[PDB]
Structures are given as structure tokens and as C-alpha cells.
Design a protein around this ligand. Structure first.
Ligand code: CYC
Ligand code: CYC
Ligand code: CYC
Ligand code: CYC
Ligand code: CYC
Ligand code: CYC
Ligand code: CYC
Ligand code: CYC
Ligand code: CYC
Ligand code: CYC
Ligand code: CYC
Ligand code: CYC
Ligand code: CYC
Lengths: 162, 145, 60, 172, 162, 172, 162, 162, 172
């Protein structure tokens, strides 16, 4: 996936050359930022269930018209799939935090996102609201830099959805 | 890789590396075989990536490695792979290109690849060719992959 | 001989790209290409088919 | 394609001499405050669609003639092209902000844009207005003291304003 | 010039996207590693004259034959050229330290190095010896990560000559 | 590609040795005979359409099934391809005659031609037959004494025949 | 390889047409040039050992330092490799004389010359000196068109080295 | 125009290299075979009118039905154009003889021949018969390498027509 | 691309006449001293690194400002470009000398060279001086009588001087 180290190696390889000062300094930055990013992922993993339940509830509060009979938000299967989707997004956000790159998101979620959402008539706004929630509670869950990395990745997901 | 007209030295050297790795089928090209005049023309802006590729395909490196010791079948499939990034879709391509070379020579055969609508749609004067056929292409024949 | 064709795109190319979608990276409209006499006609037809506008051709 | 360090090195090489201690101090200062630079670039990037949407709403509220049939942004694809151009300008402005040098914006995005618009028939003045509107929305988003520790970043605000104004000037 | 920032921005622009975390961590590493690099540049600029004279003398010690008449090293003009070339290499090493990239070295020395040396029958081994002396001296006058930066750039130049 | 000289050099290199005096003598004899070789090659080149037409007439009188509907030279297109292939093979035979080596014929013309014809449904026996008829017409023209100075050129005749029947053997 | 007959046939092959008068005239000229060329090749072959020994000695005369210990000429194996390389060059020059094209040299010596010299730290001026000696000597062993043929090939090899 | 010298220079130019022994030997063969070719060209130029008139009469002998009214040949103007065409063909044969390459023929006759003859419904068999007459009279007007060169060029024109 | 023979053919064609007897004598003369010209071409070809190194040494002694920082041969990259350009110009001069005509030198080498140099900041006077220095070195090498039969060759030296001067005129 597209991370700092993998981009470094891909650029070095595409030009057929070794790793020089620039590439090693980039990798050094990755290895320093690993600490805030990894423990932000730890904090996000710990509070995953509450975050997912709250994101689903926020979707329903903003979109009450999905849950009454006849459309996407109705039924135990649909709501379970909603929980599954928000958990997917959170999982890949934590993956991206650990890997220090949007490679997990870009490769697993964002690639093909619009075609899939169009085919199944899933509104991207639902997931935008869920991720905005996730952002709200990661603001209070996380402090200092960890908050910063988690916000960068959550917002990359949001931007891709919008 | 895309190479515009104002380009830096590192971008230029990387583009040359990519172009040689693709257009020459991952074959080792020696320092004595590298085209310095064509590289100068590309560096100036006199030709594009496309015209540079056309030059390289008309060059003795390409001819010797892919034309002069092969059958025309191997040359046609290999030119499809290297200049279009895809495989031939049917036997009509083989017949068409064989007749083209026989009646109009090797240069016209290269020009068909490089002046093709496929090439211009996907690479278009500034991007290095790449392998497309590892993804579904419209009009593909399911055996092209 | 060799002829320099200065090309422009004032909307026919634009609408063709709008229908087909951006498919190689976007580039500026006005640009010039040098073409030999042997390739002069096919390049001209290709530009006309693409919706390109040629503002002038110079012989050198 | 340069940054502040490469530009300084370029002048140093034209004079043919080593970099001076004043120049070293200046660039060390640039690298020390580059943390604020990263915060500003992240603020520009994370809010790019919001900036573009706000600027589009403002521009189409003010310049109503574009929307109407016969206007430059009427055919629904031309609206798509307008949005794409706005995003490209924002992207290159953020590039130049991170570099600290405006050359990456110019040489790659702005050198031919004037002639492109003139050949097309696009009103360049409305494009400049869109760039200024993007500058306003971007200033609102960079100055957001939340999400970051409070600090003095007037230099970043000035630099971003210069990049937006220079893009607008080159367009129109 | 290839720096961390320029490579960041280039790999972003090649695929037409905004700069994201994968790019900002790389830039962060550059900004953090600037301090030892600027220290090393300061030290190497202070001591340029001693380094250049010592490098020229080291070249003549390793190649006594070149000073003999009819050879490249004979004469006062040739040795003036030698000192000037060592000054160039040291200057560009300091530039590359300041920019935190091999971009200055690559642009001003490495590009066209082989052709120029073959045209004028300049043996790259001379400059390997000069740069090896400069490396040995840089082991002094510098300590810690600044020495690591300086030797990484110097030995980049050495590998390019070799 | 190889001519006689380059093969000789290739075996000499494989041993790692210089070229012996006998090998140099053989190459000197070749170059002395080169003018007769040029006459043979020009006889093949100059009279090529006649050779192809004669071979085609004889072949399609012999094998009428080829030109009936359902034959492999029936529609105009397949007949054009048939004549094209005969011209191509004769042209590579002339190349091999000039080079003194059958290497170009193998590498270019007969590299995979049998599998090509097998996949097309083309009767390889009939293609070989066409090559034999071309060989006969070629020998008729190459033995011609008009407009050349009379001399012994039997080695060239036998070598031309070997190129022809090597093509026919590779095909069938 | 790459010789007059082969260029003729390759040009005809790529243009999808027969061999015409221009190409047959090129081939003609090759067939008459074969006589001085084969004579030169035979003369050089007969005197290969004297030429090789003299070339090694000229190399050691022009570069006295190389024989000194710690250098590329010190030791018996290094000088065995001296003579082997000079024999290689002589062999491929005789090949090119017989082939009436530079193809043997280009395919066996020149293609990969610079990289191999750079890797093993061999100096091209050594081989230029040896080939200059061979040129001077073939000035004596040969005369007339034989000598100009030999000198053209030796000078092609020299220009390749430089 | 494709001549021996021009093919030489174009090959070397495409490879971006100097003219070496291959190119020079092809040029030498051209310069040697120039003299019988120029002898043949002078001979054919001297007997222009007889050759052209005999070729026209031969065309009319082999195609009696052409001259009768209602056909392409009937009339004074079509007679004049017949004579002109045979004269053009002879002229360009002499050009190609002098220039030691079929380039004049390919540039001035062969290129566009088929579509011009199709548009004006000119039978290639008429010109083939005229050229066969030209060959028949060349057989006695010339002898030796001059006759060989002239026959090569005339029958190149014929093969182009057929 | 044109030589003396095709030049005469074109001049005859524009009038529509057979090549005159006078033209045949001049062309046969050109063909007799073709062997004389091959030696000059080989002298240019063999000694090209020597000619270029000599001219470069003299040029960069005469004009130091090219090699200091800010000059146009200053970095290795521009220095290599300059050496390459000298290589190319000598190559095309030798091509013209072999052909007997300067049409190649106009068509391929110098078609838009002065404009390129003007756009790149290259002092065309420096390039013209470089061509003149190569002409001096080339004349030194062509006149060498070693390894060649003695004969009058003032025509070849004059013609090569015209080619070098014409190249310098087109660049400057
Ligand atoms: C994934 C990156 C990559 C690799 C690893 C790679 C290896 C590679 N080496 C090759 C040739 C070669 N490789 C060798 C090396 C061998 N010769 C032996 O003597 C040695 C014991 C041994 C080396 C240790 C040789 C001699 C050739 C050329 C063979 C020939 O020219 O006939 C080739 C064929 C291309 C060509 O011939 O030009 C490839 C693809 N190429 C790549 O793009
Ligand atoms: C450059 C070396 C080379 C050659 C020569 C070559 C031959 C060749 N001949 C082909 C077809 C053909 N070839 C023939 C020839 C046959 N017709 C009768 O059967 C005869 C017995 C016989 C000739 C005497 C025919 C009829 C076809 C058309 C086959 C079809 O359409 O099914 C094809 C398939 C593409 C096409 O239709 O043109 C190839 C590739 N391939 C090469 O790479
Ligand atoms: C013109 C005719 C044609 C077809 C139809 C075609 C299909 C096709 N499907 C592909 C991949 C794929 N195809 C599928 C679809 C399958 N897997 C799912 O589970 C389903 C069970 C099932 C569909 C109902 C999937 C999942 C892939 C991705 C495989 C991978 O790359 O890992 C690919 C490889 C390139 C790409 O990923 O786009 C092709 C070429 N190609 C053709 O030329
Ligand atoms: C290097 C980066 C780059 C840029 C920025 C760029 C601008 C650009 N804008 C274009 C069209 C356009 N651009 C616009 C946008 C303007 N008109 C509206 O009034 C808005 C107010 C305003 C947007 C802020 C519109 C509406 C078009 C469509 C013109 C038409 O189709 O008639 C086109 C032509 C599209 C084509 O040929 O397919 C280009 C090339 N080109 C580039 O290569
Ligand atoms: C893409 C749009 C298009 C254009 C612009 C076009 C005109 C056109 N005419 C051309 C040549 C030519 N055109 C003519 C026309 C003849 N001269 C007169 O005697 C006749 C009255 C006249 C008949 C109309 C001639 C003689 C040439 C050859 C010019 C030369 O080579 O000297 C060429 C160059 C051919 C090449 O280099 O391959 C073009 C492009 N045709 C097109 O399809
Ligand atoms: C992964 C990408 C990445 C980012 C985004 C990043 C930003 C970043 N911001 C920081 C604090 C800061 N951030 C800012 C930004 C300013 N504050 C004001 O409110 C302005 C609105 C705003 C300008 C946009 C400032 C002024 C500081 C404190 C500087 C200092 O520590 O002295 C710090 C240092 C915190 C510490 O270790 O104590 C970092 C590393 N670093 C990274 O590696
Ligand atoms: C920007 C980077 C740059 C570099 C590095 C550079 C090296 C360089 N050194 C030169 C001179 C020279 N430099 C030397 C160096 C020798 N002196 C002896 O004392 C030693 C044995 C040895 C040095 C260790 C010599 C001998 C020459 C003269 C070369 C000649 O013209 O023959 C020249 C040719 C000057 C000219 O055109 O007249 C170059 C290009 N030039 C550049 O523009
Ligand atoms: C797909 C449809 C198709 C067509 C149209 C076709 C035409 C055709 N007719 C042929 C025979 C022929 N056909 C004719 C035509 C007639 N003879 C005279 O009585 C008339 C003046 C003249 C017609 C008006 C002639 C003269 C030949 C002789 C060819 C030969 O001798 O080999 C041949 C050569 C094969 C053979 O020897 O039989 C072809 C290819 N072939 C096809 O497969
Ligand atoms: C431009 C192309 C070109 C051609 C065509 C060419 C042919 C050529 N044929 C020659 C003689 C000859 N040609 C032949 C060959 C013929 N004798 C028999 O009738 C055979 C049927 C037939 C062989 C296929 C022979 C035997 C000689 C006598 C010289 C000798 O035997 O060495 C000569 C030497 C001078 C002479 O006696 O006329 C030449 C140059 N040279 C060229 O540069
Ligand atoms: C096909 C043509 C071909 C050539 C030309 C060739 C040159 C060549 N010579 C070598 C050895 C060598 N060659 C020399 C050079 C000689 N010794 C010095 O004293 C003299 C100054 C100089 C005589 C001119 C040396 C010193 C070595 C040993 C290098 C080493 O192993 O480090 C090597 C290293 C591989 C080995 O151990 O054999 C190569 C590649 N190889 C080839 O395959
Ligand atoms: C330089 C190369 C060149 C050639 C070869 C050439 C031939 C040529 N001859 C022509 C006229 C003609 N030429 C003939 C020749 C016929 N008269 C009969 O006595 C014979 C059976 C037969 C000749 C053997 C005829 C009938 C026409 C009139 C055709 C027509 O106007 O449709 C024409 C049409 C031009 C016109 O009518 O204004 C061409 C192009 N022109 C060229 O520029
Ligand atoms: C068709 C044959 C052909 C020619 C003739 C040719 C000339 C040529 N020279 C160029 C640059 C150059 N040419 C020179 C040489 C001059 N600068 C002065 O300082 C020196 C006195 C002088 C050395 C003799 C230099 C230095 C450059 C690089 C300029 C730059 O990078 O700004 C360039 C553009 C960029 C490049 O290639 O690096 C071209 C196209 N290229 C070709 O393909
Ligand atoms: C393989 C490539 C090749 C070359 C290089 C070549 C050159 C060549 N030079 C020759 C003699 C000659 N060479 C020259 C050249 C002049 N002599 C003066 O010293 C000038 C310095 C010099 C000006 C360049 C002259 C004047 C002759 C005598 C030609 C004659 O006898 O009329 C000859 C004729 C030898 C004879 O018959 O006695 C040839 C064939 N031929 C080839 O096939």
C-alpha cells in the first residue's frame, strides 16, 4: 500500500537508483511520527464499539427518513450493514494510522467507492455524517498530535466520500 | 510518468529510465547504444514523449531486438505489448500489420502504432506507455488479458 | 520538408474530453508540433478529427 | 521546480560562493517554523472541497450571468470544468505553500493558463474572482485556532495570500 | 532540485492529488533533520580553505606521478584548477546539506560528470581521494548526526564518481 | 543476423582463437566469387514477379481445390495473402543467397511459419509445393546466360537450391 | 553482426522489398575491399604475439607507476590479464577486418566497455596506449590498402575507448 | 532520395555516429561502379529519340487496338503524351544510373504511380512493353557492366509497374 | 537529404532535361576522386575526439567566462551539452564532406539551431568560435600525409573549410 516507506522505495525504484539522503530523511520522519499515530490507533481500537454505535445513531438522527419502512435504513439487516460499514471505515482509518499512509484507505475503501455506492444506492452523505461524528469523539478521545493524525486520516476518508 | 515541456533534470532522467525500461522490454541497453541526439531533441522540446518513442521504435536497438531475428507474428505481438501496453485482440490485427509492413515498410508500421487512436487516448504525446491490459479495456476480447 | 503546426483547442476538443473523461493528465490548449512532410497529412487529419484548431502552419 | 532552500542555493551558485551565515540562519529559521507550514498545508488540504464549494456558491451568487444559458459555466459540463479548474488552482497553491516558493505554481499551472482561457473564450476576470473567493475561504480555514496549538502564523497567512493573489494576477 | 519537499510535491502532482499525511510526515522528517545538516554546512563552510588544501595535498600524496611534468597535475594552472574543483565539490556538498537533498549535487556535478571527465581525461580516482580526505577530516570538526549527514552526502558524491 | 563471414568469426570466438589460414582462404574464395553471387541475387530480384506468377499458375492448375469456394486460396483476400507469402519467401531466399547464410531465412521467414500455417488451416504441403515451383522458376532464370559473362556458377545453383528446399522443409 | 552485407539485407528487410542496385553496389564494394582486409587480418594474425608483447611493454613504458606495488600492474596475474586483453582487442580487430564491418568490435568489445572499465577501475588510456602501439607497428607490418583498413579498425577501437 | 551515399549518411545519422569502415566501403563501391553507370547514362542519353520512337512503335505493335478511334491512344495529343511518358521514363532511368541508386525513379515515377495510372486509366502494360523495348535496344547499345547497370534500372522500373 | 548527384538530378529536372554532357564530366570527375574524399572523411572521423578536445581547450582558454559560475559551460551538465554539440557539428560536417553537398548540414543539424541557442542563453558567437577552432584542428588533421598516397587535395580542404564556415554562419 501507499505509505511513506513504500512511496520512497517506489520513487527510488522507478528511477532505478538506491536510497539517498532525501528518502532516508522521509523514512526518519515516518519512524518518528509512528508513536503518536500508533497510540492514536490504539485509542481508536479501544473505543471502537462506542464510536460505531454513536456514528450509526448520528446518521439516523441526521437522516430520520431512512429508518421508517420502505427504504435503505429500515430493517435489522440494513442497520447491521450500517454498523459493518462504519466499522470498516474505522478499521481502515486505524490501519492507515499504523501504516503512516493513506494506502489502506485508498486501496480498500476509496478505490471503487463511487461506482459501488452508486450501484447499491448508498448515499455518501450518510458516511460523511458518520465520519464527522467519529471526528467529534476523536477530538475528545485524543490529545496533542495523535488527535492530529487521526483527524488527517478521517478527513481524507471524508474528502474521498465528498 | 508524464513529461511536460519545462522539466527538471531529475524528472528528465527518471522519464528516460522509465522509457527505456518499457520500450525496450526490460532489456539491458548499454551506454554506447543510448540515443544522445534524440535525448537532446526531447530535452529541448523539439519532440514530445510520443515522437521520442517513435524515434526509439525506429532505432536500431528496437529493430535488432524485436524485428530482425523474429517472425512478423512475434514482432506484432511484441509491438502491441510495448507500444500499446496491451495484447492483440484478434487475428485481424496480425493480418493488418503484416500487410502494412509488407506494402509500406517498417516506419509506416511503427507510425500506425504511435499515430493510433488508442495510443493517443491513453498516452497522448506526454505520458510514457504503460501496461494497460492488466485491467479491463473497453473493446477487449477477454483473451487479451 | 518539416512544418510546424500551432494547435489550439477552443471547445470541440473540450467537449470531446468532457464526454470521454480526462484520461491522460490535463494539458494547456495552445501548443506547437513539428511534423515532416511524410507525416504531414495524417497529423492534419488527426487534429481535425480530434476537434483541434490549427491557428497557423509554418514551413522551414 | 524549487523551494526556498533550492532558490537560495541557486542565487548562491550564480554568485559562485558558499552560502552565508545570514542565509544559513534564515533557512534554519524556515525549517524551525516549518511545523506551522505543515499545519497550514494540512488545513488547506483537509478542507479543499469545502473551500471550493463555498467559493462556487459565492461566485455563482455574485456572477449570475455564468449560470444562465449562453454563459461560460452554463452547459453542465462547463460547470464541471469550472470546478476542476478551481480545484487545480487550490492544489497548486497548497503545493507552493508547502514549498515556500511560488515557482511550482507558476511553471506548471499558470504559464499558459491565460492563453488557454483566451483561446477558449472564458472570462478571465471571473476566474480571478473565483481565485480571490478561494483565498477568502482558505484564510477562514487556516486561521482556525482549533485542532492545533495556538501560535503566531501571520507569515503563513501572508504567504498564502500572496500565492492566491499571484495566481489571480497570472490568470487575469 | 530533488529534495524531500520537491519529491513530496512531485509524487503528489504526478497523480494529481492534494498533499496528505504520507507527504507531510516526509516533510516533517526533513524539517527535523535540517538542524544537524545546517550545523554541518556551517562547519564545512568555516573550514573550506584547510579542507581544500589538505584534499589537494592528499591527491598529490596518493598520486605522486601526476605532478611529474607532461602529466595532468603538472604546472601551477593545473593545480589551481584542482583547488577550484575541490572547492566546487565542497560547495555543492554544503548546498546539498542545506537543501537536505542530493539535488544540488546531482544537478551541478553528477549530471554530465562522466562525459566531462572522459573529454578532459580527468581521473575520477583523484576526486575520490580528495573526497576521502574530506571525509576523514569531517570525522573531526563534527560529531553526532551532523557528521552522519555530511558523510552521507560526501559518500554520495564518492559513489557517483566511482 | 549472420553472413558466412560472421558465422566463421562466431565459431572462432567460441574457441577463443584467431581465424586460421584455411578459414581466411575460404572467406577469400567467397569474396572472389561474390560478383557471381551478385549476379545470382540480381537474377532472383529482377525476375521475381515472373517467378511468382509462374509458380502460382502451376500451383493452381495442379491444385484446383485451392481456388474453389471452401479452398484456402478462394476469396480474393486469401489469394492475395498466398501471393504475398510467396513473394516474401522468395525475397528472404534472395537475402540468404546474398549473405551466403541461411540465418536470416530461419530467423525471420521460417521462425514459426509451420505453426502459423497449421493454425490458419493452410495446407503446408501445398506451401512447400509452391516453394518448389518457385525454385524451379528461379533455376530457369539463374542459369540464364544472356546479359552476363559466361562462367561456372554451379555452387551458387546448389546453394540457392538448398535455401529453397530448406524453406520447403521447414514449412512441410 | 553489423557489416555491409548485413546492413544491406536489414535495410531491404525493414522496407519490405528486394535487394536493388544500390544495395548490390554496396555489397560489390565490400567484396573487392575483402582482399586488402583479409591480407591485413592474416598479417596481424601471424604477428599477434609480438604485437601483444610490445603493446604490454608500451603500456608499462607510458605508465611506469602501474607496475609499482599496490597498483593494477603489480604482480604476474595482472600482467597476464594485460596480455589477455590486448590479445582480445587484436582478435576482434582481425575479426572486423575479415567481416568488413565494425560489428565484431561493437558487439564484443565496445558494448559494455565503459561500464566494465568503470567497475574494475581499468583505465581506458592504457588500452589507448596499447592500440597506438599496435597502430605504429602495423604501419610496418602492412602497406597500401591493407594498412589503411587495419588503421581504420584500430582507430575505431581507440575512439571507442576515448 | 535513396542513393548509396545518402543511405550511408542516413544510417549513420539515425545511429548518431560517425561514418566508419562500413559506410566508407559502401561509398567506395558506389564510386567504383559509377564509371560504367555514367557510361551507360551517356549512351542512353545520346540515343534518346530513336529509343523513344521505337518504344512507342513497339507499344502500338503489341497493342494494335489502342490506336484505333475511341481508345486512349487515338489522336495526335495522346500520341504526344505517349512519347512524353516514355521520354520521362528514360530520363529518370538515366538519372538513377548517374545517381547510383533507384532513388530518382522511386521519387519521380514509382511514388504515386498506381493511383495516377488508375485515375487516368493508363495501362501499365503499355509502359512495360515500352521498357521491354528499351531493354532490347540497350542490349545492343551497351555491353558489359554498363549494360548490366542499365538493365538493372530498367527492370526495376518494370517490376515497379508490374 | 541531398548529395551532389541528386542535386544535379534536381537541377536537371526543374528544367526537365537530360543531364548534359558537361554534367556527366563533372560527376565522373567527382566519382574519380571519391577515394580521395574517403580519406578526408576518415581523417575527420578517426580524430574527432582529438579535434573536439583541442577546440574545447582553446575555447575555454580564450573565453574563461563560460567556465566560471554563471557561464554557459559552468556546471557539468552544460559542459557535457557543449561537448556534445561540438561532437554533433563535426559529425554533420563530415556527412556533408562525404556527400559533397551541405544539404544534410542545413536540413538536420542547423534547421533551428540559432533559435534554440537564443532561447537557452547560449552565446552564438562562442559556438561559432568553437566551430572555427574545430575547423583549425580538422584542417591540421586532414592535411596529414602519413598513411596515405600523396596527391593534390586543395579542393577537399577548401570544401571542408566551406562546410565549417557555413555551419559557423548558421549558428552565429
Ligand atoms: C527485477 C530487476 C531485474 C533483474 C534482477 C534483472 C536481471 C537480468 N539480467 C539479464 C541479462 C544477464 N545477466 C547476466 C548475469 C550473470 N551472468 C553470469 O555470468 C553471472 C554469474 C551472473 C551475474 C551474477 C548476464 C551475463 C546477462 C546477459 C546474458 C547475455 O547477454 O547473453 C536480464 C535480461 C535482459 C537483457 O539481457 O538485456 C535480466 C532481466 N533485470 C531486471 O529488470
Ligand atoms: C515475415 C515472415 C512471415 C510470413 C511469410 C508469414 C505468413 C502469414 N500468412 C498468413 C495468412 C495466409 N497465408 C496464405 C498462403 C497459402 N495460401 C494457400 O494455401 C497456399 C498453399 C499458400 C501459399 C502458397 C493464406 C491463404 C493466408 C490466409 C489465411 C486465412 O485467411 O485463413 C498469416 C496470417 C495473417 C494474414 O492473413 O496475413 C501469416 C502471419 N508470417 C510471417 O511472420
Ligand atoms: C469483454 C469480456 C470480459 C470480461 C467479462 C472480463 C472480466 C474481468 N474481470 C476481471 C477482475 C475481477 N472480476 C471480478 C468478478 C468476480 N469476482 C466476484 O466475486 C464475482 C463472483 C464475480 C463477478 C460476478 C473480480 C472480483 C475481479 C477482481 C479480481 C482481482 O484483481 O483480484 C478482470 C481483470 C482486470 C480488472 O480487474 O479489471 C477482467 C479482465 N474481461 C473481459 O475482457
Ligand atoms: C496546468 C493545469 C491546467 C489548468 C488550470 C487548465 C485550465 C483549462 N480550462 C479549460 C476549460 C474551462 N474552464 C472553465 C472555468 C472558468 N470558466 C468559468 O467561468 C469559471 C468562472 C471559471 C472557473 C473558476 C470552463 C467553464 C471551461 C469550459 C470552456 C468551454 O468548454 O467552453 C480547459 C480546456 C479543457 C479541454 O481542452 O478539454 C483547460 C485546459 N488547464 C491545465 O492544463
Ligand atoms: C487534413 C485536411 C487536408 C489538407 C489541409 C489537405 C491539403 C494538403 N495538400 C498537400 C500536398 C499537395 N496538394 C496538392 C494539390 C494540387 N496542386 C495543384 O496542382 C492542384 C490544382 C491541386 C489539386 C487540388 C499538391 C500538388 C500537393 C503536393 C505538394 C508538393 O509536395 O510539392 C498536403 C501535404 C501532403 C503530405 O505531406 O503528405 C496537404 C495536407 N488535404 C487534406 O485532407
Ligand atoms: C503528519 C503531519 C504533521 C503535522 C500537521 C504536524 C504539525 C505540528 N504542530 C505542532 C504544534 C503547533 N502547531 C502550530 C500551527 C498554528 N497554530 C495556530 O493556531 C495556527 C492557526 C496554526 C497555523 C496553521 C503551532 C504554532 C504550533 C506550536 C509551535 C511550537 O511548538 O513552538 C507540532 C509540534 C507539537 C510538539 O511536539 O510539542 C507539530 C509536529 N506535524 C506533522 O508531522
Ligand atoms: C560545477 C562543477 C565542475 C567541475 C567539478 C569541473 C571540473 C573541471 N576541471 C577542469 C580543469 C582541470 N582540472 C584538473 C584537476 C587536476 N589538477 C591536478 O592538480 C589534480 C591531479 C587534479 C585534481 C585532483 C585538470 C588537470 C584540469 C585541466 C584539464 C584540461 O583541460 O586538460 C575542467 C575543464 C576546464 C576548461 O574547459 O578549460 C572541468 C570541467 N568543472 C565544473 O564546472
Ligand atoms: C472471390 C471471387 C473471385 C474472383 C472474382 C476471382 C477472379 C480470378 N479469376 C482467375 C482466373 C482468370 N479469370 C480470367 C477472366 C476472364 N478470362 C477471359 O475470358 C475474360 C476476358 C476475362 C473476364 C472478363 C482470366 C483471364 C484468368 C486467368 C488467370 C490465370 O491464367 O492464371 C483467377 C486466378 C485463379 C485461377 O487460375 O483460376 C482469379 C483470382 N477469383 C475469385 O476467388
Ligand atoms: C549493381 C549490381 C552488380 C552486378 C549485377 C554485378 C555483376 C558482375 N558480374 C561480373 C562478371 C561475371 N558474372 C558471372 C555470373 C554469371 N555467369 C554465368 O552465366 C552464371 C549464369 C551467372 C551467375 C548466376 C560470372 C561467371 C562472371 C565472370 C567473373 C568471374 O567468374 O569471376 C562482374 C565483373 C566484371 C564483368 O566481367 O562484367 C560483375 C561486377 N556487379 C554489381 O555491382
Ligand atoms: C571480450 C573483450 C574483453 C576485454 C577487453 C576485457 C577486459 C578485462 N580485463 C580484466 C582484468 C584486468 N585487466 C587489467 C589491465 C591490464 N593490466 C594492467 O597492468 C595494464 C595497465 C593493463 C594492460 C593495458 C587489470 C589490472 C586487470 C585485473 C583487474 C581486477 O581484477 O581488479 C577484466 C576483469 C575480469 C577478469 O578478472 O578477467 C576485464 C573485464 N574483458 C573482456 O571480456
Ligand atoms: C514524371 C513522371 C510522369 C509520368 C510517367 C506521367 C505520365 C502521364 N501521362 C498522362 C497523359 C496520357 N498519356 C497517355 C499515354 C498513352 N498514349 C498512347 O499512345 C500509349 C498506348 C500510351 C503510352 C504508352 C495517354 C493516353 C494520356 C491521356 C490520359 C488522359 O488524359 O486521361 C498523364 C495525365 C496528365 C494529363 O493528361 O494532363 C500522366 C500523369 N506523368 C508524369 O508527371
Ligand atoms: C539535430 C542535431 C542537434 C543539435 C545541433 C542539437 C543542439 C542543442 N544544444 C542544446 C543545449 C546546449 N548547447 C550548449 C553548447 C554551447 N553552449 C556554450 O556555452 C558553449 C560555447 C557551447 C559549446 C560548444 C549548451 C551549454 C547547452 C545547454 C544550455 C542549457 O542547458 O541552458 C539543445 C537543447 C537542450 C539539450 O539538448 O541539452 C539542443 C537541441 N541538438 C540536436 O539533436
Ligand atoms: C575502407 C575505406 C576506404 C578508404 C579510406 C579508401 C581511401 C583510398 N585512398 C587511396 C589513395 C589516395 N589517397 C589520397 C588522399 C590524399 N592524400 C594526401 O596526402 C591528402 C592528405 C589526402 C587528402 C585526404 C589520394 C590523393 C590518393 C591517390 C588517388 C589516385 O591515385 O588518384 C586509394 C586508392 C589506392 C591506389 O589505387 O593506389 C583509396 C582506395 N578507400 C577505401 O575503400
Amino acid at each position: 500500500s501507499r505509505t511513506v516507506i513504500t512511496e520512497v522505495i517506489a520513487t527510488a525504484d522507478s528511477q532505478g537508483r538506491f536510497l539517498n539522503s532525501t528518502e532516508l530523511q522521509a523514512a526518519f520522519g515516518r519512524f518518528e511520527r509512528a508513536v503518536p499515530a500508533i497510540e492514536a490507533a490504539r485509542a481508536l481500537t479501544k473505543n471502537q464499539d462506542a464510536l460505531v454505535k454513536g456514528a450509526v445513531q448520528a446518521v439516523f438522527k441526521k437522516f430520520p427518513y431512512v429508518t421508517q419502512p420502505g427504504e435503505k435504513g429500515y430493517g435489522d439487516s440494513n442497520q447491521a450493514k450500517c454498523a459493518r460499514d462504519i466499522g470498516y471505515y474505522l478499521r481502515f482509518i486505524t490501519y492507515s494510522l499504523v501504516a503512516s499512509g493513506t494506502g489502506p484507505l485508498d486501496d480498500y475503501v476509496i478505490a471503487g467507492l463511487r461506482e459501488v455506492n452508486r450501484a447499491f444506492n448508498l448515499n455518501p452523505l450518510w458516511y460523511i455524517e458518520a465520519l464527522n461524528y467519529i471526528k467529534g469523539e476523536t477530538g475528545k478521545l485524543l490529545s496533542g498530535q495523535s488527535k492530529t493524525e487521526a483527524l488527517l486520516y478521517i478527513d481524507h476518508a471524508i474528502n474521498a466520500l465528498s | 510518468i508524464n513529461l511536460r515541456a519545462p522539466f527538471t533534470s531529475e524528472e528528465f532522467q527518471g522519464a528516460l529510465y522509465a522509457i527505456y525500461r518499457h520500450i525496450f522490454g526490460n532489456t539491458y541497453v548499454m551506454e554506447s547504444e543510448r540515443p544522445t541526439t534524440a535525448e537532446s531533441q526531447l530535452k529541448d522540446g523539439r519532440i514530445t514523449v510520443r515522437g521520442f518513442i517513435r524515434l526509439l521504435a525506429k532505432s536500431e536497438v528496437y529493430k535488432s531486438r524485436f524485428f530482425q531475428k523474429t517472425s512478423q507474428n512475434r514482432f506484432i505481438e511484441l509491438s502491441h505489448k510495448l507500444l500499446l501496453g496491451r495484447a492483440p485482440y484478434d487475428q485481424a490485427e496480425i493480418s493488418y500489420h503484416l500487410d502494412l509492413w509488407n506494402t509500406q515498410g517498417y516506419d509506416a508500421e511503427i507510425d500506425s502504432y504511435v499515430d493510433s487512436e488508442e495510443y493517443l487516448d491513453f498516452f497522448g504525446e506526454d505520458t510514457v506507455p504503460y501496461f494497460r491490459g492488466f485491467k479491463y479495456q473497453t473493446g477487449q476480447s477477454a483473451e487479451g488479458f | 520538408r518539416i512544418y510546424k503546426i500551432t494547435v489550439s483547442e477552443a471547445g470541440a476538443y473540450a467537449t470531446n474530453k468532457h464526454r470521454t473523461g480526462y484520461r491522460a493528465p490535463i494539458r494547456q490548449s495552445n501548443y506547437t508540433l513539428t511534423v515532416p512532410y511524410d507525416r504531414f497529412l495524417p497529423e492534419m487529419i488527426r487534429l481535425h478529427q480530434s476537434g483541434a484548431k490549427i491557428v497557423n502552419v509554418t514551413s522551414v | 521546480m524549487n523551494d526556498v532552500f533550492t532558490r537560495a542555493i541557486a542565487q548562491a551558485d550564480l554568485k559562485g560562493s558558499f552560502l552565508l551565515e545570514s542565509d544559513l540562519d534564515k533557512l534554519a529559521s524556515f525549517a524551525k517554523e516549518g511545523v506551522k507550514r505543515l499545519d497550514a498545508v494540512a488545513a488547506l488540504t483537509n478542507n479543499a472541497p469545502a473551500i471550493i464549494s463555498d467559493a462556487a456558491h459565492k461566485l455563482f451568487a455574485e456572477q449570475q450571468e455564468l449560470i444562465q444559458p449562453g454563459g461560460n459555466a452554463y452547459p453542465h459540463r462547463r460547470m464541471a470544468a469550472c470546478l476542476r479548474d478551481m480545484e487545480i488552482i487550490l492544489r497548486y497553491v497548497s503545493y507552493a505553500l508547502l514549498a515556500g516558493d511560488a515557482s511550482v505554481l507558476d511553471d506548471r499551472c499558470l504559464n499558459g493558463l491565460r492563453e488557454t482561457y483566451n483561446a477558449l473564450g472564458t472570462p478571465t476576470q471571473s476566474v480571478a474572482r473565483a481565485v480571490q473567493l478561494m483565498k477568502d475561504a482558505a484564510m477562514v480555514h487556516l486561521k482556525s485556532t482549533a485542532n492545533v496549538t495556538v501560535g503566531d502564523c501571520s507569515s503563513l497567512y501572508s504567504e498564502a495570500a500572496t500565492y492566491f493573489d499571484k495566481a489571480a494576477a497570472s490568470i487575469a
